[PDB]
Amino acid sequence: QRDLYLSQSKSPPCGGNPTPEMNTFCRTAIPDFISTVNFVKKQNDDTPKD
Amino acid sequence: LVMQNVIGTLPPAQTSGSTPAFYSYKYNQPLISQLNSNSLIAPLLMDTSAS
Fold first, then answer.
1. Which residue of A has its CA nearest to B13?
2. Mind spelling out the 3-state secondary structure of chain A?
3. Which chain B residues touch A15 with a CB distance below 8 Å?
4. Whether the Cβ atoms of residue B30 and residue B39 lie closer than 8 Å to each other
5. CB contact, 8 Å: B10 with chain A?
6. B15/A26 Cα distance (integer angstroms)
């Protein structure tokens, strides 16, 4: 969807007069989703270090 | 198909340096003369030369 939007960077909504959230979406890339899930770090954060 | 052939390339929405908008005067330069009624009844002898 973002590629289809950026290929049309002469027409709304990535162009013209975008609403701020749409402008932010057009600007920001798509981070990796699988790479961010990590159970060990989450459990370590939840558990007190003591 | 014939209806697209009438229209030609679809003009863009917002005007650009390469191509004019559908509502700009540059795009409608020949269309205004084509759709004008006076193009039919005003002259007394049509000019068929491609000037």
1. A11
2. CHHHHHCCCCCCCCCCCCCHHHHHHHHCCCCCCHHHCCHHHHHHHHCCCC
3. 14
4. no
5. no
6. 22
- CB-CB under 8 Å, B14 with A11: yes
Method: cryo-EM
A17 near B CB under 8 A? no
Distance CA B3, CA B6 (A): 5
Q: Does B18 touch chain A (CB under 8 A)?
A: no
User: In the block, which residue shows the tokens 């027409």?
Assistant: A11
Given resolution (angstroms): 3.6
